[PDB]
């Protein structure tokens, strides 16, 4: 692996994997706050062969984790399709917008 940029769920992560930062794929590291908003990826699960919607919520309010940086862009689109776009800080609307790390939350089947 989950700490690899090649892990299937991480197909549109631009950031640091929270699982390398004292968190997990679906939990913020201690003392960092989840974003209520996110960009969305459609990622292929090579195990069951199905595509899934993944919500990339940032964890916020701490400075950059610095570990497990990824820049994967599967199905990513520019800011005129805003919620498919990953060159913006999805912490932008948090009480503190400082970006710490990115989670990869499974929403469901695409």
């Amino acid at each position: 692996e989950v700490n690899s940029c090649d892990y299937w769920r991480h197909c549109a992560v631009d950031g640091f994997l929270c699982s390398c930062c004292g968190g997990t794929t679906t939990t913020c590291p201690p003392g960092s706050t989840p974003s209520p908003i996110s960009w969305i990826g459609t990622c292929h699960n090579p195990h069951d062969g199905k595509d899934y919607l993944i919500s990339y919520h940032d964890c916020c309010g701490k400075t950059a984790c610095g570990r497990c940086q990824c820049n994967t862009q599967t199905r990513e689109r520019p800011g005129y399709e805003f919620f498919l776009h990953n060159d913006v800080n999805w912490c932008m609307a948090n009480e503190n917008s400082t970006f710490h790390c990115t989670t990869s939350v499974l929403v469901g089947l695409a």
Partner: protein, 360 residues
């Protein structure tokens, strides 16, 4: 000897470039590095706190930055600002307060721009609802929030009008905003659909001429918006690619990935082979040089893993940038010529800009 301050930048303005270092690993200490492109000399810097953006005033006198502070960095009240800095002294002059929704994101040119007449700064907001902010530089005021641009992204100034710009919208068309002398919206218009958002998404970076802009797509097509007349006329696609190119799956990739040399109509584009879903931000295997009139490729040269570029019309130069190193090219002829590489200009930069010379 006595240590002194108060000094000006040692090289003249026409030698200067601005490398916007995001310092993504330590994004709260982003900064602008000032270099002499003629010899690679480091000239100075401007600190820009969390995820700074930067531009130079059209008249070449001031540096504008946009950034976010908090009272205690990771906690406390937020202040989004534009700052005005003196270009020769690299000193802070004025802060202009913004509402706490300025775009936080990578340094595409179109997120922080100015009207052709230099009177207004035009910036992208996202709350995450999008709108365009207008700042009156002289007055030091935030003049209005263009909520008409909801669902659109980025700012493309129209160089043939004093206070007009366009933005790319989710309908695949362009919204044009014309400001009054006070910076408020005087009129607006929407173009017909230029591109399919689903089937042929364009990169936002324009190849900008005086009265038209060209855009490249994820699949190597070219689209155009002509604003010489009363309203914007759109067209495309035409392909950057010949059969051999298509067989090897060449497509564009990068961030600030295109440029236009206005006098010749040459368009510069980063390209890579073996393109597929997810490769649109890959480093350049090559730079292709297209004649936008004939729609033919006139040169191809090694890309040096470049991601972003910028063009100087006045000295016929192209800079390219791979994240850390700046390459300087002479583009006075169809084939670019590499002059030098400035190594270690940044740790994490996706944007370089020249200090303006002339341009009236």
């Amino acid at each position: 000897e006595v240590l002194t301050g108060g000094h000006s930048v040692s090289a003249p303005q026409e030698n200067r470039i601005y490398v916007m270092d995001s310092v993504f690993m330590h994004l709260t200490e982003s900064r602008v590095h000032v270099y002499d492109y003629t010899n690679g000399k480091f000239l100075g810097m401007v600190p820009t706190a969390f995820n700074g953006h930067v531009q130079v005033s059209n008249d070449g006198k001031k540096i504008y930055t946009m950034t976010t502070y908090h009272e205690r960095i990771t906690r406390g009240k937020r202040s989004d600002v534009v700052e005005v800095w003196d270009a020769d002294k690299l000193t802070f002059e004025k802060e202009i307060s913004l509402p706490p929704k300025r775009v936080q994101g990578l340094n595409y040119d179109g997120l922080f721009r100015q009207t052709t007449d230099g009177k207004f700064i035009v910036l992208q907001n996202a709350s995450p609802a999008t709108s365009i902010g207008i700042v009156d530089v002289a007055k030091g005021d935030y003049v209005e929030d263009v909520t008409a641009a909801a669902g659109c992204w980025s700012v493309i100034p129209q160089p043939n009008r004093p206070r007009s710009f366009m933005t790319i919208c989710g309908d695949g068309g362009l919204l044009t905003i014309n400001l009054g002398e006070d910076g408020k919206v005087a009129s607006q218009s929407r173009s017909k659909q230029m591109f399919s958002v689903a089937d042929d998404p364009i990169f936002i970076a324009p190849a900008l001429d005086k009265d038209k802009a060209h855009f490249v797509s994820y699949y190597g097509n070219v689209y155009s918006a002509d604003f010489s007349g009363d309203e914007v006329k759109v067209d495309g696609p035409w392909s950057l690619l010949n059969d051999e190119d298509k067989a090897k799956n060449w497509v564009p990739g990068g961030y600030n990935l295109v440029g236009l040399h206005r006098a010749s109509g040459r368009m510069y584009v980063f390209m890579h082979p073996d393109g597929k879903e997810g490769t649109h931000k890959f480093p350049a295997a090559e730079i292709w040089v297209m004649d936008t009139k004939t729609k033919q490729r006139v040169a191809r040269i090694p890309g040096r893993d470049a991601l972003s570029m910028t063009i100087d019309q006045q000295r016929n130069l192209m800079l390219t940038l791979d994240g850390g190193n700046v390459n300087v090219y002479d583009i006075s002829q169809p084939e670019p010529k590499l002059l030098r590489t400035i190594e270690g200009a940044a740790e994490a930069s996706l944007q370089v800009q020249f200090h303006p010379v002339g341009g009236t």
